[PDB]
Structure formats: C-alpha cells, structure tokens
C-alpha cells in the first residue's frame, strides 16, 4: 500500500517471517490488475507452508 | 453435441478473466465455476 | 516430476496442472515394475533349468 | 559363448552436453542396473568356456 | 521431438520449453536400452542351454 517504491536497478527487499497472514484479502478479494503464479497453486496459498 | 447451455451474464473487465476452468476469486467462487473437464467457448464483446 | 511425494504434487499444484506431473510419475513407476518382473522371469528360466 | 558387450550411460543417452547430465539425477539408477545386467552376462560368458 | 540433436534444442527453444523436448529424447533412448538388455539376457539363456 506504499505510495513511493523503488526501481528495477535497486529495489526494496523486505523479509517477512515469524507471523501469520491472510491471503483471502490478497487473492480471493481482488482489486488488482494482474495476479499470476507459477510453481505454487494460487488457490491453495492459504493452505501451503 | 447433445445440447448447449448459454449462460448470459454482465461482468466487469477486471473480473472477466476468471471465467475459465480452475479459477478462484470473488466472481469465480461464490457465483459461477467451471470444472476441469468442461468443454466450450467463451465469447466476449465490449458493451460500453 | 517436481516432487517425488504425491502429497507434495496435488497440494502444491493446480488440478489441471497436477495431471501432467502425476502421469509422468506413474509411468516412471510402471517402468520400474517392468524392469523387476522381466528380471524375475529370466531368473525363473535359469532356476528351472 | 557369445560376444561380450558393455554400454556407457553417458555417451549413449546424452549428446555430450552439460544440461543432459543434470537431468539424469531425477532418472537415477535406470542405466546403472542395465549396466550391471550386462556385467552379469559377461561374467557368465567366461564360465561357459 | 522436433529435433534429435540436444544442441539444437538448447540453442533455440526456451528453457521451460527445452525440458519437455530433451526428456522425450532421454526416455526414448532408455526404452531402446531396455529393449537391448531384455534381448541379450534371453540370448544368454539360449546360449547357456
């Protein structure tokens, strides 16, 4: 949700660990232009670890 | 083929790509799903 | 296949995407049985001789 | 007796490229036991003479 | 497969598309190797008697 981001030559790399999350507001609820996944099933994102 | 079921619905352009086999979302889960063995065509036209 | 465990395939991939990877894994396990039984029939022809 | 033969796994399966030998780790022991089965023929050809 | 040369697959097709076409050539050479070992074990049994 941040206004200012970084560019492709140097990005902002953040580490997220030791918490719980909710992927229903990210994936199921979708006010997003493009969501894509490759090796992980996008439906089962709340299941898998 | 035996018969055709024409399902007519008006859907927004952000959610229009969720009509396909194996989709999960707002419009996909709680309204209209397709199975993996479903066979048919999807015809879209700009109604704006 | 991407994994050798069937619980790590179908839960980590889509049900359209799992039908490619499981059917490669069963066909590899059918060829492991075709090397075993053919080896036992040739050794049965030696041990009955 | 017959003619004793042996099959290399590296040169017959692969076209001497580095990408082909990395994909044989998932296939594993397929060419290993077929090499040892031809070794078991060749030790019995000397015992027939 | 499209080309039987492994150098023509890697220098042209995409690396997701190359792993399908190379593994068809590996599987067909293992079935020809499984054909050769199965015949030479039976010809070893015919030359034993």
* Secondary structure (DSSP) of chain D: --------HHHHHS-S-HHHHHTHHHHTTHHHHHHHHHHHHHHHHHHH-
Resolution in angstroms, to 1 decimal, for this deposition?
A: 3.5
**CA-based nearest residue in chain E for residue D16:** E6
Structure tokens at B29: 């889960």
**CA-based nearest residue in chain E for residue D21:** E26
Asked whether the beta carbons of B21 and C16 are under 8 A apart, the reply is yes
**CB contact set of B11 (below 8 Å; sequence gap of 6+):** B19, B27
Q: Where do we find the tokens 């109604």?
A: B47
Asked whether the beta carbons of D34 and E24 are under 8 A apart, the reply is no
Helix or strand holding residue C33 (H, E): helix C18-48
Distance, CA of A49 to CA of B27 (rounded, Å): 26
- Nearest 10 degrees: Cα torsion D3, D8, D14, D15: -70
What's the N-to-C CA distance of chain E in angstroms? 42
For chains B and D, tell me whether 3 or more CB atom pairs sit within 8 A of each other: no
> How determined?
cryo-EM
Distance, CA of D10 to CA of D27 (rounded, Å): 13
Does the beta carbon of D5 lie under 8 angstroms from any beta carbon of chain E? yes
Q: Among partner residues D14, D24, D41, which is closest to E44 by beta-carbon distance?
A: D41
Interrupted backbone of chain D, residues before each interruption (C–N > 2.5 Å): none
What's the N-to-C CA distance of chain A in angstroms? 24
Does the beta carbon of C49 lie under 8 angstroms from any beta carbon of chain E? yes
Phi (first) and psi of residue C21, to 5 degrees: -80, -30
Q: How far is CA C39 from CA B3, D32, E48, in A?
A: 53, 14, 17
Q: D20, B13, C12: which is closest to E7 by C-alpha? A: D20
Reported for A26-32, long-range contacts at CB under 8 A and 24+ positions apart, including other chains, are A27/B24, A27/B25, A28/B24, A28/B25, A28/B26, A28/B29, A29/B26, A30/B14, A30/B15, A30/B25, A30/B26, A31/B14
Helix or strand holding residue C45 (H, E): helix C18-48
């Amino acid at each position: 949700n941040a206004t200012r981001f970084a560019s492709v030559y140097a990005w902002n790399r953040k580490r997220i660990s030791n918490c719980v999350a909710d992927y229903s507001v990210l994936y199921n609820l979708a006010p997003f232009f493009t969501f894509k996944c490759y090796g992980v099933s996008p439906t089962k994102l709340n299941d898998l670890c | 083929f035996t018969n055709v079921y024409a399902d007519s619905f008006v859907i927004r352009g952000d959610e229009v790509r969720q009509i396909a086999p194996g989709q999960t979302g707002n419009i996909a889960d709680y309204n209209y799903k397709l199975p993996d063995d479903f066979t048919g065509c999807v015809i879209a036209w700009n109604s704006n | 296949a991407i994994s050798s465990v069937l619980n790590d395939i179908f839960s980590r991939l889509d049900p359209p995407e799992a039908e490619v990877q499981i059917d490669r894994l069963i066909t590899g396990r059918l060829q492991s049985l075709q090397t075993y039984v053919t080896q036992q029939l040739i050794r049965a022809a030696e041990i009955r001789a | 007796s017959m003619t004793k033969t042996s099959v290399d796994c590296t040169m017959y399966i692969c076209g001497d490229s580095t990408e082909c030998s990395n994909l044989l780790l998932q296939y594993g022991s397929f060419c290993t036991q077929l090499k040892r089965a031809l070794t078991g023929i060749a030790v019995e050809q000397d015992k027939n003479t």
